[PDB]
Write a protein that binds this DNA or RNA. Structure first.
Ligand SMILES: [Zn+2]
Ligand SMILES: [Zn+2]
Ligand SMILES: [Zn+2]
Lengths: 376, 117, 1178
RNA sequence: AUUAAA
């Protein structure tokens, strides 16, 4: 058993500390107008203090292709990790596991901090409100829980009779949408825990749901081949559109914060991108996942860059407008990657796989020979 | 120089100064479960009665607490107003180190918990 | 809620420079541009750049280029503005402004491809033959402007739709020697970054597309595809050799269509990073990552490296012009440059945003070249930080002034050009002595046998004569008409004689002795210039006097037809022959309102203005003007100016040539000077502290200065109140000084302070530090400035964490290895008395320690009679890379008085480090709150109490990612996050609790935060990366804030520049308002003055009228420019630069606009002038 | 004290 009462030798842990990068960026912004005034980082190990966070290198999103392994964070329970989410300030990483527990890992040195039995059933959904107060989680039993930064459960109610796959907040966080295996999306009032509407029409398990960044639009993905993607009006409850985008089981639908793009991952090995203003024609199609595409994550800083996870354990990186993958690791995990979470500074990526571990990936050091197992 | 000298504001009574003193626009705390330990101390509750037991957004504090809250430093204080440990940054009030008191000498000299010897 | 934005200092710092025919095809001009500023310079042969034209834009220039259109007398300027705007402008003869030929918009959402955030600046390129121009838009759309009604319809090329899928364009340049406009594009089809080079090395490519203007086809020729990943700009080689030179970070490449590629390695860092065939260039170990290059002649390129080093690169060729080798010659180092251009052969201009832009002259040595500095354009660099303090040398006569006497010290420049700028807005005289002389109202100083020998005073009914010399004594001896008042007194001839005029007559003086006197309605105004004397009676009768050698004043009655009464006069000699058709001119204003210029020896009319008093913007040939003065200013009195005084309103004109009448026209020039016995308000002076100009007397005294730079300088002098009369004074006790009366009747003998330079927009002293100045803090006690500075040293070790302690790896590389730059931080002490650094008062920090913040903090103490003590607190962090945990120190220093070292009076001040301890995390921001020190340590904000020598933890709160800025008012702390937003915190003293009052939930990359202060409203002013100013308000009862937990923005404004430092002063209606000042990263100073709602609404109607009904430079929209981040919005900030256009209008135009917006010109003028008056600080 | 030492 582990209770914080066992003596062990002091350990100095591996760190990915963003503070030197921010300080360097704070100095450069003073005298550098933008990227074109930025002095080049040399591909040498001695140029360690010239690094800046992704906000510094806006013209080159290739910095945030995080294929440098940092640490593997595994619980002693050894159960699959279904969702990973960063605390809104990046202080901690929270993982939802099949055991129903929340595990907290320190955001600087990725070591265990605390664990709590959050849900009775596996934790399937975990989302933070746009204001940093609220973290909403859902489980395979159909219950939705309200949490705060101090990881104190505040409200509990059963939203669905079946497994809730994903939840998404409205911009003002007054309402949120949940998708379930019962085949319906449901719009909820956060403060009263009351379902405003029930959104029906998919005809099979709804595996993903996303709220539009500003408009008031709900996009859903389902197992149903006839209704793979649907667009909804959360107020009226009506189906605005149906998108026959994938052959099999759309697993993720993520709307880019620019408000224009819909990112879809599916079991047909494909990630597709769409313009919600023009839904008849599909935008770029992303190919390169040998097995199913299971997780996607838009980069918080670079609006065209996103990471993708696969059922084989591959973790690939793509950019909008680039046909091929900008980077990737074919054997990032030994099992299906369920979730990808970016640090608020998009310098660290975390992945939680169907294997009982979660891994942290950072940007590659300038001047290193990427001859490790994950690169070469 | 010294903006405090050339541009003094002590003679000015700002609106938000009145707003926080009068607890202005403070809606009752929903969801009785939560605590909001990063909130201000209720000055109305200190003088006499606030009228919102647990529903007040602000902290209703008590003076019997002597040891600082170890979870509050880590940002994981679930108890909130019903917490027996002081939410203050007094180093003298830090709890005694579990490892220095029992397991001989503590591993890191940088720990904040008090060492007795 | 409501405010008006005013800029007090125009931005300094040049990003673009070019050499083109701006005015005409006979000469070329140096055209430079900055942030929303355009400057045209002539080269005067020591060589000096003298300003010929300056224009302001409602938009920041993103790219500048010039083209010679078909059948044109000038080069059109191609200016690019943020997003997709291309404006084609020319100089306009006639009206001396710019002329917009075409303005193009390419701001459609389709062209953006769904990318809401624009990271690519629009880049304009011009074909060398002038066949077309191209502008690259959003990084993907190539706009083509064909040239021959001088423009053909433009078309857009999608570079993705081309062959080879460019998709990441680094640089694009038109190539020489082609039958069709050929554009070479340097691009990365697959992008990489330094760090993933091991898996993706050679990523850059070039294609040359041949642009068919008519068929609109553009095939690709000459593709290369394995260029090094770190390819920076490319440069097109001129016609004889041709091709392109591609700059890479670590290598240099020459590429031509037929020849195989030629490339060299500039350092050993190319080994594992580039598979391109590279040959080690011998004797050079450099980098070209951020370098400016231009071609001098052919096969010779001058390259300004990062760090300022200048290299001459020679393309060594065979007889048939194929490049076979490179030659590198390291010439002298120079300023950090943003642009470079070649003037006339032998001259090179280095445009600089960091440090002063300087003009170089290169000469071949007796292949190699030597560079020397001929001129420099002053640049208040990126204003990282600013400190307000009081100047040390205020004269004793101004000590009882009620308004505070204070100045600005700015951390400017960067690196080797890092400096401190001492900024004072107004001129403060150094009074030598004061004479209590009542009754006398006007003065004249004359030169006698070039010191001033006599000082002549006019009383109500008597004249007082003072003989100035070793001692100033009154002369009761004869010679001067002391019986009554004197209309005017001056020097006639060549200072040999003295001329004195009274209402009775005109008197000629040899000195103390009178040569002869000529009696002559009473005389009210006299004009003297050269051997010509013109006097005017009260009814407008004009007669002229002339020196004829025997000397003697000779009467010559001017032939003038008095259709209208003459009300004022002026005489002027033209030394530099702008007045084409030493010549002499008389300037005359009639009662009907007509202004006339006359050839002076004869009296023939040359110039005529029908409606002079209204204040027309341009005066072209064919109420109650009170005073008129023509003065020639500049180098050798080259540029003449016209000064006019009408209806308590100052309006001043520049003169420019324009082709038997005078080939000149007058252009109104903007200013913010209001005028709200005949005594002249305009006092021309030559050589006051070596400065030539005009002093304007009145309620707002001003110094008008024009040096050899040719830029109009207007410096206020209001410390002594209104000035009645003024005169130059050159004396043994007053070297090159001046003379004036106060309103109380006090005569001041004064000199200009010597430590300031008055040839800038503000009186400035720039102290070169040779290192980056990060933070400056003024210590009230000991009256000194602390400056946190850093200098670059080679990095020799890589810190590592082995699990026990820090382990350092020595960097072992080849001799051809560029060491990384490591910064060493120092805190210095600067004395305002002598702006040199105080010796033996310098704090050196640890090896990798970076000053993240340094402020003057008032911490409570039991020593002084008050509580607060005022130390200097610095926050530091040890930067050792991502892999090492970053931890910080808090340094609290006191500046103490000590006995100075013998022979070193400056050593009376010294640091006293009361506290310097390692913190449990990085110290990223510092602040003080009610005598407590507030520190952002990691992701927490701590509040400390300072004991004798220890810091005691009082309270903390959990905060966001990275707090880089905190400011506090009373018990409230405003914390700015690097990415999240601003936060509002309060501290309660009774219960030691630090809580979050409110915060802005939306993301925001904040630069700096301050406070907007009203009588009771407190606004949180926020600076942004997108160059926006936001005011947030805490409104708990407002619905938009959920329960007061959301901060709501209540005012929006897009300043064209980044703001990193803030400070606020009280207004000079304005009972408890404070003006929030800021210094921009582009060298400017701006204001944000709170406003009443009614005045805001009135001036908002005025602002809309000025936006709609006035043409603007480059056709830009003032309203769209000040919109929020579109270059949601809460327009509650007025644009004072736009509101200044109302002052620039004529009276008729002002009245018409006022009636259209349904108000009174007097009311609008009252509002505008009140805003100008309340902000007259520094 | 809710896992401070996972
Ligand atoms: Zn209460
Ligand atoms: Zn507690
Ligand atoms: Zn201990």
């Amino acid at each position: 058993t582990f209770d914080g009462k066992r003596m062990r030798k002091a350990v100095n842990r591996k760190t990915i500390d963003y503070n030197p990068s921010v300080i360097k960026y704070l100095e450069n912004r003073i005298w550098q107008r933008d990227q074109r005034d930025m002095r080049a980082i040399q591909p040498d190990a001695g140029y360690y203090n010239d690094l800046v966070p992704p906000i510094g290198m806006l013209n080159n999103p290739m910095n945030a292709v995080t294929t440098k392994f940092v640490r593997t964070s595994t619980n002693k329970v050894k159960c699959p990790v279904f969702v990973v989410r960063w605390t809104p300030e990046g202080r901690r990483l929270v993982t939802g596991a099949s055991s129903g527990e929340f595990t907290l890992w320190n955001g600087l040195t990725f070591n265990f901090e605390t664990i709590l039995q959050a849900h009775d059933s596996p934790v399937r959904a975990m989302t933070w409100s746009h204001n940093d107060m609220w973290m909403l989680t859902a489980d395979h039993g159909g219950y939705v829980k309200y949490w705060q930064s101090n990881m104190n459960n505040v409200k509990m109610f059963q939203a669905h009779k079946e497994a809730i796959r994903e939840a998404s907040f409205s911009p003002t966080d007054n309402k949120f949408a949940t998708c379930s295996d019962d085949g319906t999306v449901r719009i909820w009032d956060f403060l009263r825990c009351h379902e405003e509407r029930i959104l029906r029409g998919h005809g099979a398990d709804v595996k993903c749901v996303d709220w539009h960044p500003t408009k008031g639009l709900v996009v859903s993905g389902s197992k149903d081949s006839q209704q793979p993607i649907k667009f909804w009006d959360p107020k009226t409850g009506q189906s605005l559109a149906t998108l026959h985008a994938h052959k099999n089981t759309v697993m993720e639908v993520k709307l880019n914060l620019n408000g224009n793009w819909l990112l879809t991952a599916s079991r047909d090995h494909l990630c597709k991108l769409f313009d919600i203003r023009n839904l008849k024609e599909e935008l770029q199609v992303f190919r390169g996942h040998k097995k199913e595409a299971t997780a996607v994550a838009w980069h918080p800083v670079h609006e065209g860059l996103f990471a993708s996870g696969g059922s084989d354990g591959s973790l690939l990186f793509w950019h909008v407008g680039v046909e091929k993958e900008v980077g990737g690791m074919e054997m990032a995990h030994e099992g299906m990657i369920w979730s990808l979470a970016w640090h608020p500074l998009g310098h660290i990526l975390c992945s939680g796989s169907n294997d009982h571990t979660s891994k942290f990936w950072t940007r590659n050091r300038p001047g290193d020979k990427m001859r490790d197992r994950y690169n070469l | 120089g010294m903006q405090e000298i050339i541009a003094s504001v002590d003679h000015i009574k700002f609106d938000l100064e009145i707003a926080v003193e009068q607890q202005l626009g403070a809606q009752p705390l929903p969801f009785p479960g939560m605590d909001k330990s990063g909130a201000a101390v209720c000055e109305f509750f200190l003088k006499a009665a606030c009228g919102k037991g647990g529903m007040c957004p602000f902290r209703h504090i008590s003076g019997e607490k002597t040891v600082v809250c170890k979870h509050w430093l880590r940002g994981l204080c679930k108890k909130g107003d019903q917490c027996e440990f002081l939410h203050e940054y007094d180093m003298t009030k830090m709890p005694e180190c579990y490892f220095y008191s029992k397991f001989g000498e503590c591993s890191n000299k940088e720990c904040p918990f008090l060492h007795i010897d | 809620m409501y405010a008006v934005y005013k800029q007090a200092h125009p931005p300094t710092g040049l990003e673009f420079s070019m050499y083109c025919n701006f005015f005409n095809n006979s000469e070329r001009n140096l055209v430079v541009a900055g942030t929303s500023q355009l400057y045209v310079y002539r080269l005067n042969r020591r060589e000096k750049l003298e300003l010929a034209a300056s224009f302001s834009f409602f938009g920041n220039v993103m790219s500048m280029a010039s083209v010679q259109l078909a059948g044109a007398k000038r080069d059109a300027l191609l200016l690019s503005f943020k997003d997709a705007k291309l404006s084609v402008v020319e100089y306009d003869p006639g009206t001396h402004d710019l002329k917009t030929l075409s303005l193009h918009y390419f701001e459609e959402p389709e062209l953006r491809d769904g990318f809401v955030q624009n990271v690519h600046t629009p880049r304009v390129r011009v074909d060398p033959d002038g066949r077309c121009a191209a502008m690259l838009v959003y990084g993907t759309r190539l706009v083509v402007l064909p040239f021959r009604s001088s423009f053909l319809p433009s078309y857009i090329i999608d570079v993705r739709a081309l062959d080879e899928k460019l998709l990441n364009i680094i640089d694009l340049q038109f190539l020489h020697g082609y039958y069709e406009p050929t554009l070479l594009i340097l691009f990365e089809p697959n992008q990489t970054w330094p760090g993933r080079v091991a898996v993706r090395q050679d990523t850059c490519s070039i294609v040359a597309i041949s642009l068919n203007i008519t068929q609109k086809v553009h095939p690709v020729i000459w593709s290369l595809t394995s260029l090094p990943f770190d390819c920076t700009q490319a440069l097109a080689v001129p016609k004889p050799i041709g091709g392109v030179v591609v700059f890479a970070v670590n290598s240099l490449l020459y590429l031509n269509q037929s020849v195989p590629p030629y490339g060299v390695a500039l350092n050993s860092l190319t080994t594992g990073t580039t598979a391109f065939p590279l040959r080690t260039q011998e004797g050079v170990r450099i980098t070209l990552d951020c370098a400016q290059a231009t071609f001098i002649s052919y096969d010779k390129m001058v390259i300004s490296l990062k760090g300022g080093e200048i290299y001459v690169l020679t393309l060594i060729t065979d007889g048939m012009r194929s490049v076979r080798a490179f030659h590198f010659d390291k010439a002298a180092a120079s300023v950090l440059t943003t642009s470079m251009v070649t003037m006339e052969p032998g001259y090179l201009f280095l445009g600089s945003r960091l440090g002063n832009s300087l003009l170089l002259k290169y000469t071949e040595k007796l292949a190699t070249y030597s560079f020397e500095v001929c001129d420099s354009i002053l640049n208040i660099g990126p204003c990282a930080n600013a400190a307000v303090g009081e100047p040390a040398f205020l004269s004793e006569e101004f000590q009882n002034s009620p308004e505070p006497d204070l100045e600005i010290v700015v951390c400017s420049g960067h690196g080797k050009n890092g400096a401190l700028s001492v900024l004072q807005k107004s001129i403060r005289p150094q009074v030598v002595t004061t004479f209590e002389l009542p009754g006398c109202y006007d003065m004249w100083t004359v030169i006698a046998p070039r010191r001033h020998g006599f000082l002549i005073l006019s009383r109500e009914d008597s004249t007082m004569i003072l003989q100035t010399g070793q001692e100033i004594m009154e002369l009761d001896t004869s010679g001067f008409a002391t019986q009554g008042p004197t209309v005017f007194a001056g020097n006639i001839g060549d200072n040999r004689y003295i001329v004195q005029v009274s209402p009775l007559g005109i008197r000629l003086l040899e000195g103390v002795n009178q040569l002869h006197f000529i009696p002559v309605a009473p005389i009210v105004q006299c004009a003297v210039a050269d051997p010509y004397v013109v006097i005017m009676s009260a009814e407008g009768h004009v007669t002229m006097f002339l020196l004829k050698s025997d000397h003697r004043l000779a009467l010559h009655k001017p032939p003038l037809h008095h259709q209208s009464k003459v009300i004022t006069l002026c005489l002027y000699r033209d030394l530099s022959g702008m007045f084409t058709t030493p010549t002499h001119w008389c300037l005359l204003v009639r009662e009907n309102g007509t202004m006339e210029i006359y050839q002076l020896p004869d009296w023939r009319l040359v110039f005529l203005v029908k409606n002079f008093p209204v204040g027309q913007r341009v005066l072209v040939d064919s109420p109650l003007v009170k005073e008129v003065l023509l003065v020639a200013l500049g180098s050798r009195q080259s540029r003449p100016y016209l000064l006019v005084h009408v209806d308590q309103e100052l309006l001043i004109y520049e003169a420019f040539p324009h082709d038997g009448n005078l080939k000149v026209r007058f252009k109104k020039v903007p200013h913010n000077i209001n005028f709200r016995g005949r005594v002249a308000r305009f006092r021309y002076f030559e050589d006051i502290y070596g400065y030539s100009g005009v002093f304007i007397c009145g309620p707002s005294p001003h110094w008008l200065l024009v040096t050899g730079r040719g830029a109009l300088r207007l410096h206020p002098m209001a410390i002594d109140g209104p000035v009645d009369s003024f005169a130059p004074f050159h004396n043994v006790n007053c070297p090159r000084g001046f003379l004036y009366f106060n309103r109380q009747g006090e005569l001041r003998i004064s000199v200009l302070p010597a430590y300031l330079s008055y040839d800038a927009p503000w009186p400035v002293r720039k102290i070169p530090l040779r290192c980056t100045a990060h933070y400056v803090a003024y210590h009230v006690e000991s009256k000194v400035y602390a400056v946190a500075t850093s200098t670059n040293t080679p990095c020799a070790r890589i810190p590592r964490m082995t699990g026990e302690e820090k382990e350092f790896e020595t960097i072992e590389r080849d001799e051809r290895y560029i060491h990384p730059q490591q910064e060493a931080f120092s805190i210095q002490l600067i004395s305002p008395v002598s702006w040199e650094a105080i010796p033996n008062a310098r704090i050196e920090l640890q090896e990798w320690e970076h000053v993240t913040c340094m402020k003057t903090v008032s911490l409570r103490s039991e020593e002084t009679v008050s509580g607060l003590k005022g130390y200097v607190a610095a926050g530091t962090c040890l930067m050792q890379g991502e892999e090492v945990t970053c931890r910080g120190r808090i340094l609290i220093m006191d500046v103490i008085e000590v006995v100075p070292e013998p022979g070193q009076p400056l050593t009376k001040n010294k640091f006293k480090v009361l506290y310097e301890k390692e913190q449990k995390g990085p110290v990223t921001a510092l602040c003080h709150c009610n005598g407590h020190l507030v520190s952002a340590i990691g992701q927490k904000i701590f509040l400390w109490s300072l004991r004798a020598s220890e810091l005691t933890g009082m309270a903390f709160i959990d905060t966001q990612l990275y707090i880089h800025q905190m400011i506090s008012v009373k018990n409230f702390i405003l914390a700015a996050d690097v990415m999240k937003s601003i936060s509002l915190l309060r501290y309660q003293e009774e219960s030691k609790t630090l809580s979050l009052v409110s915060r802005d939930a939306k993301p925001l990359e904040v630069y700096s935060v301050d406070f907007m202060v009203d009588n009771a409203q407190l606004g949180f002013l926020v600076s942004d990366r997108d160059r926006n100013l936001m005011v947030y308000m805490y409104l708990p009862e407002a619905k938009e804030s959920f329960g007061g937990m959301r901060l709501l923005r209540r005012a929006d404004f897009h300043v064209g520049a980044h703001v990193n430092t803030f400070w606020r002063t009280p207004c000079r209606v304005w009972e408890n308002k404070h003006i929030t000042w800021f210094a921009t990263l582009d060298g400017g100073i701006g204001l944000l003055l709170p406003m009443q709602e009614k005045t805001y609404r009135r001036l908002l109607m005025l602002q809309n009228a000025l936006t709609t009904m006035l043409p603007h430079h480059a056709g830009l929209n003032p309203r769209a420019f000040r919109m929020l981040h579109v270059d949601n919005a809460v327009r509650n900030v007025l644009d004072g630069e736009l509101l200044n256009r109302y002052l620039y209008l004529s009276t008729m135009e002002r009245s018409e606009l006022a009636k259209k917006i349904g108000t009174t010109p007097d009311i609008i003028l009252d509002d505008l002038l009140e805003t100008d008056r309340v902000t007259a600080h520094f």
